């Protein structure tokens, strides 16, 4: 995680040697387990 946010788009935490990506409300984790995909028209933190 201290390396490239562990290629997470948003949040990175570590379980037992596994980097483990995650996301703000209104986003859903991509299949790749890294990217964060907006579920709606006005996802938080994006300019419009």
């Amino acid at each position: 995680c201290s390396l490239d946010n562990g290629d997470c788009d948003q949040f990175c935490h570590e379980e037992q040697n596994s980097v483990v990506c995650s996301c703000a409300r209104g986003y859903t984790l991509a299949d790749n387990g890294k990217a964060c995909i907006p579920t709606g028209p006005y996802p938080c933190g994006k300019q419009t």
């Binding site: 948003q10 949040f11 935490h13 933190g45 419009t48």
Partner: protein, 233 residues
């Protein structure tokens, strides 16, 4: 905001403006969701009556997207003191939900530990507001934003005459004369991470505005993430 620049259309969409009984803006806020505005406790004392406007860019001209919202409940942190400005946090519940639009949209709340190690350690955050454009001048008629370096906490303390608690952090420049000012308080400090903006600060106080050797002080949102969640229930 002293220095910096006007926000382009859709550039600062999480900015709210708190307006008094004379319908004048005295303070800012950050849109957290359709019902919740993040602001400073001290702003509560700077008006007899207030509502929340979203979408304003030029406050001398309606432009579409703008709305006023009545505040239903004020959640004030009850450890706030006007003596130290410690715990300078409050959350407003609106009567009626915001309609997101261009120029109206929430900032993301970060996860606590992650924000500590990775947002607080970026180089810059962005502060925005309608406040005075000079310490002794007039409020801006336009939303402005300013990119501000995070400032190490020992540098912050060194420069400051007043206490800097763990619930605060400094951002700004040493010689450059650009910073937040009066009317910007309660407003957003946000930090970009991989083109998503998370709210990392509340505009709190400064010893003057943009004085050489002085930095704006902000309430440290990552210190209050549990309290913020609970307030949004």
């Amino acid at each position: 905001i002293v220095g910096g620049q006007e926000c382009k259309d859709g550039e600062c969409p999480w900015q709210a403006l708190l307006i008094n009984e004379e319908n004048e803006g005295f303070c800012g806020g950050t849109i957290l969701s359709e019902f919740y505005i993040l602001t400073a406790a001290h702003c509560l004392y700077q008006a007899k009556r207030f509502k929340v406007r979203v979408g304003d860019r030029n406050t001398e001209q309606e432009e579409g997207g703008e709305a006023v919202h009545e505040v239903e409940v004020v959640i004030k942190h009850n450890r706030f003191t006007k003596e130290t400005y410690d715990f300078d946090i409050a959350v407003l519940r609106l009567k009626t939900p915001i309609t997101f639009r261009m120029n109206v949209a929430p900032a993301c709340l970060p996860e606590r530990d992650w924000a500590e190690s990775t947002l607080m350690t970026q180089k810059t955050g962005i502060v925005s507001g309608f406040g005075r454009t000079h310490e002794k001048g007039r409020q801006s008629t336009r939303l402005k934003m300013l990119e501000v370096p995070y400032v190490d906490r020992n540098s912050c303390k060194l420069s400051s005459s007043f206490i800097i608690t763990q619930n605060m952090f400094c951002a700004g420049y040493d010689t450059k004369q650009e910073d937040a000012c009066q009317g910007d308080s309660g407003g957003p400090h946000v930090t970009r991470f991989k083109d998503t903006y998370f709210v990392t600060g509340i505009v709190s106080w400064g010893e003057g505005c943009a004085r050489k050797g002085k930095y704006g002080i902000y309430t440290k949102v990552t210190a209050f993430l549990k309290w913020i969640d609970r307030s949004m229930k």
